[PDB]
Amino acid sequence: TLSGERREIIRRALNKKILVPNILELMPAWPSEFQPNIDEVNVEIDEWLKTVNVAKEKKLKHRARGNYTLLAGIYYPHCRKEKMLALSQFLYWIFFWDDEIDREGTILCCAETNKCINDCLGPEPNYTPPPGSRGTVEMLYPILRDLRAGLSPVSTMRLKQELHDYVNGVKNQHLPNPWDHFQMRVDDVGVIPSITQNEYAMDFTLPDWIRRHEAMEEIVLQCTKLTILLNEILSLQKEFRVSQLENLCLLFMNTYDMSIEQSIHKVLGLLKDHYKICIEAEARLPWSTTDEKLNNNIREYIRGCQRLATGTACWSYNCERYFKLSQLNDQQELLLDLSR
Ligand SMILES: C/C=C(\C)CC/C=C(\C)CCC=C(C)C
Ligand SMILES: [Mg+2]
């Protein structure tokens, strides 16, 4: 039965301590940087959060442990400070929304959220939340409006589809097979809208014909996979402690009777594989022989993709969403601790 499988995983992983190498070292060509106005933007974010209709203690737990302005600051380290506000607000939205979301309640929330996405990003814009909107939907209307104000319709269409994909993936969601779990996250994970928001952050539009080029599709895919893989390792302690066993490390343990150490090693191996694929795709991009602006846009778009992966790791090593920062030693090696 499913309960026997879950119970045995818990039995095998309980109280295990695993030292994880610094994941940033597995992506050595891709540097991590910090937007220089994070503190100033956080002051704005704190004033804004007072107006958000999410419980005070919940907003504060996210602000304290997640501190998503820092995440935006690492995703978008070269944007101007004026862009940082909407970018930080969006991350507060998606984490609040994911937190707050009972099959009926989920279906209703997803429908109201998809409606907001259509209202704000679709061909007949309406930025006014319907009366009686829940807090995590009401707050999304002005965020999408502000993002759309700094986006071409080309980029807006991609953001719209990507947000629908995220919301519908949440709606749709034996222990599962590890590869089924991985592929589901590759389709469903909320990271692609962050790649598109680099176009907002750096005020440019990547043309569709380049976005659809096999090598650019590959880079987006590889960076999505890399972000998932490192998140599986970095979130293992958090998820195991609330008995959320659908973590890739535990699924490798279950399906293949791997030890927890072997399974983490396997995920780290996949990270290195997909990084090398990603790097090799750059040579195949349709770089222009003449157009500096176009090539700067291609460069910025792929740096945005790479920063999703390095930035999610770097942020995880600089906040307390996933573990206590005392669990890092002086080499940024993480001592996971699956105690309860
Ligand atoms: C799966 C979580 C991560 C890869 C961390 C970075 C992800 C985002 C910034 C958007 C996803 C938001 C969620 C609440 C899952
Ligand atoms: Mg996770």
Side-chain angles (χ1 to χ4, degrees):
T1 62
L2 167 62
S3 195
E5 272 184 10
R6 297 178 52 92
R7 278 23 142 177
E8 197 48 37
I9 288 307
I10 292 166
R11 179 199 286 191
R12 297 169 50 198
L14 185 60
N15 303 312
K16 293 287 292 160
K17 298 190 168 89
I18 313 101
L19 190 67
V20 176
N22 177 11
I23 290 168
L24 292 182
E25 290 181 13
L26 304 185
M27 296 169 287
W30 300 349
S32 293
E33 301 162 282
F34 302 85
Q35 207 276 340
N37 316 113
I38 289 164
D39 296 337
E40 180 178 1
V41 175
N42 250 338
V43 176
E44 295 186 82
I45 281 289
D46 285 334
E47 307 186 21
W48 167 76
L49 280 165
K50 299 193 312 206
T51 73
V52 169
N53 294 317
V54 169
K56 177 184 168 76
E57 64 281 7
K58 175 172 303 299
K59 297 183 298 187
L60 194 275
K61 185 175 208 299
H62 280 273
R63 168 66 167 92
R65 302 193 181 186
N67 183 28
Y68 309 116
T69 302
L70 175 61
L71 178 56
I74 298 161
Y75 282 167
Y76 316 113
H78 301 318
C79 72
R80 298 237 303 237
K81 69 133 86 146
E82 288 86 354
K83 303 293 175 171
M84 278 288 284
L85 185 60
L87 293 163
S88 299
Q89 290 169 327
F90 177 89
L91 291 171
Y92 273 92
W93 168 72
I94 202 176
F95 281 93
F96 286 164
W97 190 89
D98 185 279
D99 186 348
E100 298 273 32
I101 211 172
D102 196 1
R103 186 75 202 192
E104 168 168 353
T106 294
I107 285 167
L108 294 180
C109 182
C110 290
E112 295 154 16
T113 306
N114 278 319
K115 177 188 191 308
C116 170
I117 292 161
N118 279 324
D119 285 347
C120 294
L121 301 186
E124 281 181 326
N126 176 13
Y127 303 116
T128 303
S133 295
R134 68 187 72 209
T136 59
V137 172
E138 180 188 33
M139 72 182 292
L140 182 61
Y141 277 88
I143 295 169
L144 296 190
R145 176 179 183 168
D146 291 346
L147 288 177
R148 185 173 185 168
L151 287 173
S152 163
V154 171
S155 308
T156 295
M157 281 186 284
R158 297 201 283 258
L159 182 60
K160 184 182 189 306
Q161 163 186 293
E162 288 154 10
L163 289 172
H164 286 316
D165 287 352
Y166 168 67
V167 170
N168 290 337
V170 166
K171 202 230 294 179
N172 298 329
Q173 296 180 16
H174 273 326
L175 288 171
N177 171 279
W179 308 108
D180 270 333
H181 165 82
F182 184 52
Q183 187 50 241
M184 171 198 76
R185 295 200 69 196
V186 167
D187 294 315
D188 292 354
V189 69
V191 310
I192 305 199
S194 290
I195 291 169
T196 293
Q197 282 170 75
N198 194 39
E199 296 185 87
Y200 175 87
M202 303 301 282
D203 187 16
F204 76 100
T205 311
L206 190 78
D208 178 77
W209 73 268
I210 299 187
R211 181 59 182 81
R212 307 270 80 82
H213 188 281
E214 61 82 20
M216 184 64 81
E217 298 268 24
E218 187 87 299
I219 286 167
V220 168
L221 180 66
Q222 295 314 313
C223 290
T224 299
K225 290 189 172 181
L226 292 170
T227 307
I228 296 169
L229 289 165
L230 58 90
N231 170 265
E232 295 287 349
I233 293 168
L234 294 169
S235 67
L236 173 60
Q237 172 177 307
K238 176 181 185 267
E239 289 166 355
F240 184 73
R241 281 180 183 181
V242 293
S243 302
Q244 278 160 216
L245 313 187
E246 298 193 357
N247 174 285
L248 180 59
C249 305
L250 305 176
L251 304 183
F252 279 145
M253 285 180 73
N254 178 58
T255 292
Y256 296 112
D257 189 40
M258 289 178 213
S259 73
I260 184 56
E261 293 90 352
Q262 287 175 319
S263 76
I264 291 176
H265 182 266
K266 187 180 185 62
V267 173
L268 294 165
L270 295 173
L271 265 168
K272 301 198 302 228
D273 293 346
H274 288 285
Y275 168 78
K276 173 193 164 78
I277 295 179
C278 197
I279 292 264
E280 294 172 342
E282 298 181 23
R284 305 195 313 271
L285 285 164
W287 302 102
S288 173
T289 53
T290 58
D291 190 340
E292 177 178 26
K293 168 71 179 178
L294 182 57
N295 283 348
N296 283 347
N297 289 358
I298 295 172
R299 295 174 179 117
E300 189 51 48
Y301 198 90
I302 70 178
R303 289 295 292 129
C305 294
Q306 298 160 0
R307 287 169 189 140
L308 250 291
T310 61
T312 302
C314 185
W315 167 69
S316 299
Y317 289 135
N318 281 108
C319 75
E320 290 202 321
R321 176 177 171 82
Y322 297 106
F323 37 77
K324 293 202 269 197
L325 289 177
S326 61
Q327 303 183 228
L328 296 172
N329 69 25
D330 292 329
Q331 290 99 67
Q332 202 157 278
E333 301 184 325
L334 168 67
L335 182 59
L336 285 169
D337 183 355
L338 305 198
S339 294
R340 289 175 164 181

